[PDB]
């Protein structure tokens, strides 16, 4: 028997003592929890940062620039008329060594208050189809200085010929290296 | 009349992370040993990083032909055969994680040089997103306001397929090394 939903909020991702993951299993239950069907695989991974948590969110908001923040993107553009609101889309043209591919993607959550952000692929990407992808800015006080935690989850579709085991190592894989290149323009 | 081959000319750009005066010393390095021949469905890069560490600590990790995996990403494991040899012409079959169905990368080891510590690998089977495949990898050592600071320098040459561009082929694979010479830093800096 297969899962029917995610439980990333009983497992602590690397990169995260005990003490402060207690203090995020609420938000995982909240953003990070995905409902299953029998050819999807999700993860959750994190990322401490040693930066203020509202330098971080301004950094991961901005849906019209991931590169800053990725590896992997040659360019990424958006419509005439983007506004930064939930259903706007960009198209990223990926790295990848094979012929130029655009992944749309579409804004699914924009959440100032929690520092929320979240997007949807839905169309160009084919080794991650129905790829979707929740992002969660957390800040805690550490003797006189922020110290922030980046939550970062998706959920994606096995493809056939593909085990589950390639698929999560291929995309846990890019977001660890992704989160890396935050901590470093993040960082002072 | 015999044919005439065009050569890579690494030696007249500074690649990006080392400055002006540390290239000097090693432009006669890449003469020597970062320079292909070069056809017109070919690209080459040469790429370098900094790293606070001894050069023979640094070197012991790159000479490493059977574990690749400890300085690169997206390696999900490396076999070589029961019989193996650290020696040139020896194989190995690498594992490579890329969101697509298992696919196993043979590679040859072509260099192996413990003077100058220079390495260097082909693949020669089962990589089509790299296609003939050739790099090689050199350290070097500077003595640096009293310590050891070391620059690895990395190159390759590699097939354009058809229906690519050069510059997104090149943009991946310059990509690729220079994500795997950070982790190279992660793994020699103490």
Same mark, same amino acid.
Not at 13 to 40: I, R
Not at 80 to 109: C, H, K, Q, Y
Not at 115 to 133: A, M, P
């Given at each position: ?5 995610? =439980? ?6 690397? @990169?995260? =003592? ?5 203090? #995020? ?12 069907? $029998?050819?999807?695989? /999700? ?23 991931? $590169?800053?923040? *990725? ?15 939930? @259903? ?39 080794? #991650? ?9 957390? @800040? ?12 970062? /989850? ?22 660890? #290296?992704?989160?890396? *290149?935050?901590? /470093?323009?993040?960082?002072?």
């Amino acid at each position: 028997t297969r899962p029917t939903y995610t =439980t990333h909020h009983l497992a602590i991702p690397s @990169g995260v =003592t005990q003490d402060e993951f207690d203090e #995020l299993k609420q938000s995982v239950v909240e953003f990070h929890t995905y409902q299953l069907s $029998q050819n999807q695989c /999700s993860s959750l991974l994190a990322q401490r940062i040693r930066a203020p948590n509202d330098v971080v969110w301004s950094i991961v908001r901005r849906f019209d620039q991931p $590169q800053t923040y *990725k590896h992997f993107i040659k360019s990424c553009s958006v419509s005439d008329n983007f506004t930064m609101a939930v @259903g706007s889309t960009r198209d990223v043209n990926v790295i990848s060594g094979l012929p130029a591919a655009t992944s749309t993607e579409r804004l699914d959550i924009l959440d100032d208050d929690r520092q929320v952000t979240g997007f949807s692929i839905i169309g160009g990407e084919h080794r #991650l189809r129905n790829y979707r992808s929740v992002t969660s800015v957390h @800040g805690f006080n550490r003797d006189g200085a922020i110290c922030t935690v980046v939550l970062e /989850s998706y959920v994606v579709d096995v493809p056939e010929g593909n085990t589950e085991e390639d698929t999560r190592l291929f995309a846990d894989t890019v977001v660890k #290296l992704n989160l890396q *290149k935050l901590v /470093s323009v993040a960082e002072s």
